Amino acid sequence: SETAGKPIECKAAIAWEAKKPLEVRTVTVAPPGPGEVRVQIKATALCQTDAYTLGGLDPEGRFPCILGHEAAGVVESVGEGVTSVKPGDHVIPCYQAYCGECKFCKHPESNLCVSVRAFTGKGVMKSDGKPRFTVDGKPIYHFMGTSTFSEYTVVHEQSVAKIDVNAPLDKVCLLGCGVSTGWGAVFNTAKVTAGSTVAVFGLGAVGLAVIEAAKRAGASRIIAVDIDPTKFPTAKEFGATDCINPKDHEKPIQQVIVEMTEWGCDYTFECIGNTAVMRAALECAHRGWGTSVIVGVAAAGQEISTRPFQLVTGRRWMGTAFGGYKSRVQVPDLVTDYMSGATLLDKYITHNMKFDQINEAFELLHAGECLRCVLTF
Amino acid sequence: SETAGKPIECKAAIAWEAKKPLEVRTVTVAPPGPGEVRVQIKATALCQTDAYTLGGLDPEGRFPCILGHEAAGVVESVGEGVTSVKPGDHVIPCYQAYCGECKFCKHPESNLCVSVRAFTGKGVMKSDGKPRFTVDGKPIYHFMGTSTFSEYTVVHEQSVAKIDVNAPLDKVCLLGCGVSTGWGAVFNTAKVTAGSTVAVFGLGAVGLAVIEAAKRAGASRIIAVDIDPTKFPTAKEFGATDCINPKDHEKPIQQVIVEMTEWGCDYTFECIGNTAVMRAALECAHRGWGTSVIVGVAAAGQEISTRPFQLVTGRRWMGTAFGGYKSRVQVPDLVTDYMSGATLLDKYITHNMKFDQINEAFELLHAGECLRCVLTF
Numbered sequence A, B: 001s002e003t004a005g006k007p008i009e010c011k012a013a014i015a016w017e018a019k020k021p022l023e024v025r026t027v028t029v030a031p032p033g034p035g036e037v038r039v040q041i042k043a044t045a046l047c048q049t050d051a052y053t054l055g056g057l058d059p060e061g062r063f064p065c066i067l068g069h070e071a072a073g074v075v076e077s078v079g080e081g082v083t084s085v086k087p088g089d090h091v092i093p094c095y096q097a098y099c100g101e102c103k104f105c106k107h108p109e110s111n112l113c114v115s116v117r118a119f120t121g122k123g124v125m126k127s128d129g130k131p132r133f134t135v136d137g138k139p140i141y142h143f144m145g146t147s148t149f150s151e152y153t154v155v156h157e158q159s160v161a162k163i164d165v166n167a168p169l170d171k172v173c174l175l176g177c178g179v180s181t182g183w184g185a186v187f188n189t190a191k192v193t194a195g196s197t198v199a200v201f202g203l204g205a206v207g208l209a210v211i212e213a214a215k216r217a218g219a220s221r222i223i224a225v226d227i228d229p230t231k232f233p234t235a236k237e238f239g240a241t242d243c244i245n246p247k248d249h250e251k252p253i254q255q256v257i258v259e260m261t262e263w264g265c266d267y268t269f270e271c272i273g274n275t276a277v278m279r280a281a282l283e284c285a286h287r288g289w290g291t292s293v294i295v296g297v298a299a300a301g302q303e304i305s306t307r308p309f310q311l312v313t314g315r316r317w318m319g320t321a322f323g324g325y326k327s328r329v330q331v332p333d334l335v336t337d338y339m340s341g342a343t344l345l346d347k348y349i350t351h352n353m354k355f356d357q358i359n360e361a362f363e364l365l366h367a368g369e370c371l372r373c374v375l376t377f
Ligand SMILES: NC(=O)c1ccc[n+]([C@@H]2O[C@H](COP(=O)([O-])OP(=O)(O)OC[C@H]3O[C@@H](n4cnc5c(N)ncnc54)[C@H](O)[C@@H]3O)[C@@H](O)[C@H]2O)c1
Pocket: A047, A048, A049, A177, A178, A181, A201, A202, A203, A204, A205, A206, A207, A225, A226, A227, A228, A231, A246, A271, A272, A273, A274, A277, A294, A295, A296, A297, A298, A320, A321, A322, A323, A368, A371, B312
């Protein structure tokens, strides 16, 4: 390699402080250390988690940072000990890591690895506690263990899923978070049953992923709910048999859904991050056995509430992180399902744009006119 | 039978108004209308559910009425159409019905029959909207579908479980409420796996049934929590391995449990009815997969709260009504298990008194002098 062992200069989008546009300038990326992988991103998408940390909402937010966490790339070099991947391999960097040995990687019903989360959340690396980006000798900090807003990034060995070398990296960059989450929420968390009734709250990428997996699961009725009727026709494509605007009704949205279905829906998914809607989705879960899965991320410190009656009479409140998928073992599986023509992964992307335009991708987001925009360099 | 079709003059305990003593006088019990069943009560027990309504704290309350809902007895006569039982059958009248045909009886995960609840909730019979007790002509209303504080009572067919002729009626009366709830919380709602860790909050009858079942499910560790440490000996007898008093500790009780285990207990049970503890029980359920079952009924107007993060990071909130036991189907199955010699059911009875002393039995309940007090005629 020209590059291996050497630092690397490349074009990144740096966030200097919150609530403020991104600076597409140049960055130096250190060589990878023990148990690390330097990845060359080739495509990367925008997620609402990214705009949320840009808004000063994250308590653990650490500026300056390189945002970005939905991406695919190519291994460029690895540090010492790294036997899982080798330069040339095609990868998806995963904010949710996989160790194989900790308590949660072993339990069949979780994926909340504790391998490296102590450090990715502070923005640094495990080998020496310091980050790996630099701008004029001053450190830039990592976000969510990935930082896919640079041409090259360095990530923990536990965070790289190796994928089929023949998958289009400008499509499966979506499998690195948002779309996987909505899929797993149905398949792993809720385990949606054939013939069930589903109600999804919020028809963004995640929301539509839920609706997709719900059809693939045999849902006999999928109710979609958004305060944006211009999301309905795409939602009916992905499989929604019903579309509801809460503003079109007086009764609270929960009582509305309980009315169309008599008792509620077998499964309800909240893909917004609003605690009022969360409580609402629980309360239109079906009496006696309904499940509500909280998918979205709320403002830190904000609370959800309901009446204990809603659970003493049969509903179940749960959540999901990255759809419950065990990243490294199972993200290669999602690529495989993609490569068998089984998903609608292609329909999720609405805009391909170049990385110099990152800041206008954020304004196309903040207005909800796209679902997902893949950026290439 | 000398009493089929006639009214019966029997001894009973009438709640004339809230917050006064009951009156042990004679009452007139109509014969069973269609689909109804008249039952000679041979033993009956007290619950604090009876006290809370007698105390004037029920919004659903209706006076005068005849409380009592944990009993066992013998069919005296049956109304028109009734084939499931016959005179001489031994029965447990359950406050939770089983009709076999509503959409909750045909579902594996519920026991919340809707066939008669609209009429029992108002102390009447479904067949004509009216009660079946009278004094001097004026009507006395039912309680919970059962009204077991009377030598004879009239109940809905859907409410009558047919049990072994060899069970001692002065022990299985417990199976119509509190013990079943606690057991069913473990076996049906949580399904505690062998080897796992449990915390129980509240060491009354329900909480002890939770411990008992948790030991029998094979739980490696059972943590009992209560602010009255004088319940720790008996809790230990039922299979506990630790005892916590939240007042001994200078941090939130959910921190104590989460520190005694590394990440919380795999299952937690709230057996009090106190929404703050409800949240504590949820927040000390194991990260990633923990399950919290609300078993206690909160004061009306209270609300459970947590941060949505708690659910996203893998905890599941749920609850249970009568242990999710499909009453008429499975209460016979619990009576059979009892007689196999597999349960500690006899150990929940702390006193045996005469029906004339129902009021001293109610003063014992108010002080904790009493797990379950059983009355006979
Ligand atoms: N749990 C996880 O592992 C995980 C992973 C990825 C994303 N997320 C969270 O999922 C949420 C959604 O992800 P996205 O990328 O789909 O967001 P997105 O913003 O594309 O979708 C937002 C949708 O919410 C709708 N909405 C807003 N308020 C509403 C209301 N009151 N009633 C009905 N609809 C309403 C908007 O109209 C819009 O369509 C985000 O909060 C993100 O943080 C969670």
